[PDB]
Amino acid sequence: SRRYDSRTTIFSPEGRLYQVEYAMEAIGHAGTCLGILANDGVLLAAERRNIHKLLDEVFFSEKIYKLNEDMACSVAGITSDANVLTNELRLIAQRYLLQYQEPIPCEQLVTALCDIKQAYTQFGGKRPFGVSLLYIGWDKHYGFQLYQSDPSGNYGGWKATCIGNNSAAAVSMLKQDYKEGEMTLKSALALAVKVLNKTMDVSKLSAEKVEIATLTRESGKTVIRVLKQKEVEQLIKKHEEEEAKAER
Amino acid sequence: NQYDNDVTVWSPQGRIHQIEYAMEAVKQGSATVGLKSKTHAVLVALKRAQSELAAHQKKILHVDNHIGISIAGLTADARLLCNFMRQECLDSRFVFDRPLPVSRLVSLIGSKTQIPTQRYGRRPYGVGLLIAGYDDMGPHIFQTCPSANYFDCRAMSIGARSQSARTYLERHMSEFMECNLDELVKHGLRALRETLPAEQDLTTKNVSIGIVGKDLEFTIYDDDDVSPFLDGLEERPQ
Amino acid sequence: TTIMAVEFDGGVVVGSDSRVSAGTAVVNRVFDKLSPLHQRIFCALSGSAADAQAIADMAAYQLELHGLELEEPPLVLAAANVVKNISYKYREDLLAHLIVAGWDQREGGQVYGTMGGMLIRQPFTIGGSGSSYIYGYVDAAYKPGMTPEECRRFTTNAITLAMNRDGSSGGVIYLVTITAAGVDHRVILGDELPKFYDE
Amino acid sequence: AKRGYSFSLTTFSPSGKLVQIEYALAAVAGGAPSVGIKAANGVVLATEKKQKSILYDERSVHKVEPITKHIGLVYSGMGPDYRVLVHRARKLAQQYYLVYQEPIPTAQLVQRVASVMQEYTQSGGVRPFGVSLLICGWNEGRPYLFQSDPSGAYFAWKATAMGKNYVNGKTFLEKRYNEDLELEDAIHTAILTLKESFEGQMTEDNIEVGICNEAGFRRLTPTEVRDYLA
Amino acid sequence: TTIAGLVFRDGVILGADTRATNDSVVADKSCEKIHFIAPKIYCCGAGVAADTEMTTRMAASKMELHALSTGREPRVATVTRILRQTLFRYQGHVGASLVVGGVDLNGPQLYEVHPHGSYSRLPFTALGSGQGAAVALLEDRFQPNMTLEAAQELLVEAITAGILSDLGSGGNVDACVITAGGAKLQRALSTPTEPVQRAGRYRFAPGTTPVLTREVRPL
Amino acid sequence: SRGSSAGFDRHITIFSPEGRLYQVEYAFKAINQGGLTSVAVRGKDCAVIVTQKKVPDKLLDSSTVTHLFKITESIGCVMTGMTADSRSQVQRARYEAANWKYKYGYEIPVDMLCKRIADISQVYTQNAEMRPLGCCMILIGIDEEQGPQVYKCDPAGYYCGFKATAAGVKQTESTSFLEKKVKKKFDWTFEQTVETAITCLSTVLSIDFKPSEIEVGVVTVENPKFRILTEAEIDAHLVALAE
Amino acid sequence: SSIGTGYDLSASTFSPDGRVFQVEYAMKAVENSSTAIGIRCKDGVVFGVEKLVLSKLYEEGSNKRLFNVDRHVGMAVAGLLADARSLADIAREEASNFRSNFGYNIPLKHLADRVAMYVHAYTLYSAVRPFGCSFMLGSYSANDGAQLYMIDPSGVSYGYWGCAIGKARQAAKTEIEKLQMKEMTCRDVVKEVAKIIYIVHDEVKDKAFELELSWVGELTKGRHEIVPKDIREEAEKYAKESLK
Amino acid sequence: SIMSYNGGAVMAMKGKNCVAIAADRRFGIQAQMVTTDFQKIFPMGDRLYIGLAGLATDVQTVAQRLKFRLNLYELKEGRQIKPYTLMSMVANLLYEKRFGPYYTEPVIAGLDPKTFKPFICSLDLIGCPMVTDDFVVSGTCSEQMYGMCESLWEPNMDPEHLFETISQAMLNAVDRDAVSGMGVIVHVIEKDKITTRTLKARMD
């Protein structure tokens, strides 16, 4: 029996966890996924990896999930593991609601799933979830928020971040462009398209290859929308028109 | 070897090495001798000291008024088997009010000791026992091993250098049936003596005796209570 | 209910009334209370309808498996034993007496009573609510060594007399005869019932 | 007496690849070919049922199966594994009906069935399923076609192929398939995609085909398959 | 409830009223009591409303799943045994008195199953609080091998008798004919009572109700 | 790159790089370790089972050496492979058949029994802790609706209905024999099917055996009771072949 | 004949040539054990076992290899005796369960069938190892007649007229074939059973032995018991003197 | 009675392309009233409402647990819930507590999202669904509410007239029940809008 045990929840001589770091590699080969925090909102923007002339487009989104009235997340890694975690995220959110009769604060929901993912690295002898998650939302304590989730079960609050393919290139690109405390949603939407265009593989960019979702606070209600194709078209073309005004 | 890490793995020769490795633990413990007459069953065991400052290890244990044991091998496995035997004897008295026949108690050990030899992650019992008892059928001397096998014997010796004791008893096995109790114990002591190196012989500190029979319940004599048996000694010859 | 079984040389006879009751109402005036457990083992049903039928099913289930494992028709003794065991294990929860009668190669025709979880073999046996009114009749009208036809009349007469007296018994008389050759199922209708003193 | 293994048989390799899932994918990529086509007013699902001997009774077992009144299934990969998923799919379809009193949306069945597939990529003492599923359905007056696979991942298709020659069958469909087909046309282009990968002569016994519309899901009779085979 | 079942030459027929009671007040005037199990097996439920609803839906759920796995026409004897073993397990706490009727390869069949799990197979039966009225009509006019129309009329009369004589029964008589060919669910076959017409208008001109607070949410 | 291996895929029921299950494939070779061949043929009115009865010595009780088994009054089977493995499968089949009738109230169809055994066999194929059964079950019997039936199940979990089928050591040669007899359309009577089955096994092994050397079990439309033929009745069909 | 390293450690692993070596190695344990015999007569069944004296310090009658599993059923064992006793306990419980459920003495064939299922169950998993012994079951009644069965580590059981297990199972079987057991009384069979053990015994490899003998026939009224000291010694003398 | 402990009245009515739902505003323990502004109708969506009459705890508990299941439905499914489906969801929720039931009898009133169609239903405390084309009533004054609705209801009522009818039916049935009242709240559901009103009910 122990002959067949891969020993998944075990320590390496250096003091690190192999399966966790091997799971990290899986994220790198998945779609580029960025989140940017603005003054009057917060957004997710992600590369679609399911592209084909023959795909049917039935759902509102491929990588964006609504978890809560005031929260949404985006995913990078193994999509089945992603579906398992997002469904669980929707459950924890509802359990908190049922108990307290008010929406779960952003950080708390993230913390809860991270505790499950961390438990998978310590006991049970199971493979960890090969997924990194980007959470965006609004609570009554810290307002608009953005969070990052590792397969390690570790989390952090960001103003701008990215996970997936060419991730390190995308963040240093954001690190220069991001204007702290001065960013509007219009500025952040333009930056998203800019970072994606340089980071993505097929080069020209398309309304079928990217997915963008905005979280705004409108009329005392948290409004979440996955941007329509006609909207993404104007977002790509406004960057294209500026790419033609950059020479003389 | 790769056929010797688990009890659930058969050797190509048709053997289980982990049973045989547990059988080695018995041989490493100090010698113990069991013998019987038509009226009594006597256990004689050699206490051992790791250093001269430490006391000697307990070798003979109580089971019931009519049953006693001497151990050889791992201490914890001996204590675990002793507690099972005691519990079985207690349940027998609790339910039937009569003492559990020796044959049946040993059969229960044979059934219990077999279980761990056949399950993965489990291990054999690292102890061999000599069981002296008295019931309706008279006195009994029994032998158990790491392998669930058990034997009904006229006399037996297990532990380190038990071969010497085994040969002594084998010569004098026809002697025992008409033996007086005092003559029976001396026979047991004389066999135990053979196990020791020529430099040393049986002392009041390193000899333990257990006796059960028609006359009395199982009794352990240890120190001052042991010298009556040692005194009156035919000298160590060669 | 009224149920009855009688032993003869070649086999057995099993009879019952055809009534099911709830309070003072009859809900089924034509119910066969003679359930097969195996090919030559039947049982007669009484007591709680649901409790009885449930025992009949599990008994027939186990005897089918037991029959296949032995590759031989189950012993009537074996049949009676399994019904007896279910009845005993749930004597507080299941409320039904089942008469088990049949035929096997080892011991011929046999009749067993299992009421409450006990087991007894009898030359003949009666059961049910209507059995009270025919204890005197069966004691007086019984002869040892009755022919199949005589046993058939004996059960018919006794059940007829019980049904007329008992309010919880009524309908027709279902008869089965179990021998080495097989099972003969017949029905005794209202016009065909034996007449006695009725006033 | 027994008690199962509690450790995962699917782990991450240094490359970040769950090898057992990709190895399970190889099992389906080597199975008999299967095709599904969403056709504006219905769905069609066809498979190669070549038993490779005349001794077999072609009518005895089926590869195109009904899950409920409005949902059907085909597979490429292992037959025994597929049977497990069919039984699980049928139970999930009933579990949904009992609670909501409404035919399960195809999307919802696929999600529930895909989650069962996910379990076997993480649970102890088990290997993943060596089957990819093709699930058709009709709900809200709309045709649906879905693909489930060993990963636990699911996709929506206008048209696709899997099994042997899944790559050639896919490019064939790209050129051949056009949106807004009639259902009877889709059965043709389904059997045509099947002909690309065949090897032998097609009889109504060699292939199996099911259809789904507003009237529910049914498998075509052998007589119906013969009429399309011309 | 009044529910009844009948065997004829070419098949079976089931009957039911349409009344539901909460306490001693008619809750539903047009509730359905003839339940779908298979395309050619149907079940009438009497007793605890929610109980007859769930048991029947559960049975139908298990019957479709059984037909899917066997690829065969469901058996009514299978329906009856599934039902009674479920109900026996609950020891009569699920108050569902059922009349199950259908057509098999073994011909037309009619069973009744009580909440405690007892069953019986018979040519005619009646369950519910109006059962006395229905059996009276059946024992009076039943013959073996009746014509569909002769069988359909007697059943209507049996349910009608229950409706008119029983206080826990009313509304329309629902019928379901099952033939070796198919099943026709004749809902509201006959309808004895009519009073929808009246001559009393009780309208209120916008503004008669005194209001303290008004709020309008645009959509 | 046919037949590649990596990890423990040769030892436990997990996938190879090709996507195969070697432990399942080895289980089929265990069927041949029995050293026996089984043949079943279907007619219009019957289904016939035939298998070699090898008796090493007269010390064995010949009546207790059989691979012919009864699951139900209507259903019988022939077992090929490891004897103890086969007996376990038979016992489980009886359990499943009797269990079916307790739940549903009618006699289990031959096709349904086969699927149930196949689904259980599938579990040994997906769970790592236990090996598959190195045996083969060919079922016969008459469906009240669909005529005579012949069904076979796998250690792989594969199940199917057949016009005719062989199993065991000389399987491959006897399936080819049966194909030639199928192409030409005979009158599939009781005698024709019995002899087709017997002659199939007498040619692939080349014996011309005594009645004691084989076993024959039959199922017929007129008599759906599963019957093993005994010496005197097989002897009749064997002298009927020499006419 | 064997497979190293991988395919012979677990019973849940098949070898490439379709073999379970864990069962075969357990089958080797019995082949190493001293011979157990048993043959069916006209009016019952007799058992004979050679018991190798490991030491003269052991009691005459120790390590009994002949068991009473039920009043009418006797068991003869060869192999790892520790396993043989557990199977004797399992067999006892089965015969006990049958009477508790059905009310009469277990039919021997069914008893053998049931115990065989339990043995076989230990050949499928990595969690447990196969039983390292083989055993025979013998009974007699007027209804079923004389019956004799034998079970091995794989879980296989067959009926027998004559049967032998252990060291010299081959040397025994060829000597058994010589007997017209279908016509012989069980009083006669004991004499012949005793001599075959003596012939089979290797007095130049193994040191010495005791002969164990069992009854189960009409002379015992259908009950399985030990052959008396008187009848055994007559058969022992017969064995020594026809050895020339 | 157990339902009698807290009292309460919930009623639903149908009209021309619209539905109305009404409840009393009382929270009281047997002898006394505690709150005048207690909630009994809860929105399960834009254009779909559930009114709950019975034991105040179970009224609140069912509303919170239905919301739990509804939100998960609306997240897993890509859509807003159809009225028939909510009915079946409440039916399953309640029946799950078959032998230890929530002491509340719910009323569902709404317009089908997409299709426009008006839908009303009431349920058992163990989850028996009742669908009608007119009105459904629940509470301690069922008999009083039945008497009004039967006499007052008409087949094709416009929003203006429907509000008046459901009000008058509620006002007067509540005035005969000692455990119902302290104000009445009315929701009128149209496609374009939702109109909420508290009436000048008797405060005795």
Ligand SMILES: *[C@@](C)(CO)[C@](*)(O)[C@H](Cc1ccccc1)NC(=O)[C@H](Cc1ccc(OC)cc1)NC(=O)[C@H](C)NC(=O)CN1CCOCC1
């Ligand atoms: C005669 C006719 C009088 O009872 C028989 O005993 C008959 C036997 C029988 C067996 C199998 C199938 C049908 C008929 N028994 C009944 O008719 C039986 C009487 C009975 C009811 C309740 C009992 O207490 C547990 C014991 C016996 N009738 C029924 O069971 C009928 C179908 N249903 C009910 O009466 C419902 N009961 C359940 C228990 O509580 C009272 C209501």
Ligand SMILES: *[C@@](C)(CO)[C@](*)(O)[C@H](Cc1ccccc1)NC(=O)[C@H](Cc1ccc(OC)cc1)NC(=O)[C@H](C)NC(=O)CN1CCOCC1
């Ligand atoms: C007739 C009308 C009663 O004479 C039928 O039996 C009918 C059955 C039916 C109704 C609708 C759909 C299918 C079948 N029964 C009812 O109308 C039934 C009445 C009843 C109340 C209490 C009972 O005692 C336990 C048994 C029957 N209707 C109901 O169940 C109503 C909708 N709900 C209640 O009365 C509340 N019950 C729930 C169960 O616990 C007692 C209170």
Ligand SMILES: [Cl-]
């Ligand atoms: Cl130690």
Ligand SMILES: [Cl-]
């Ligand atoms: Cl030793």
Ligand SMILES: [Cl-]
């Ligand atoms: Cl009597």
Ligand SMILES: [Cl-]
């Ligand atoms: Cl483990």
Ligand SMILES: [Cl-]
């Ligand atoms: Cl699992």
Ligand SMILES: [Cl-]
């Ligand atoms: Cl179909």
Ligand SMILES: [Cl-]
């Ligand atoms: Cl059910």
Ligand SMILES: [Cl-]
């Ligand atoms: Cl909940």
Ligand SMILES: [K+]
């Ligand atoms: K803040």
Ligand SMILES: [K+]
């Ligand atoms: K298959």
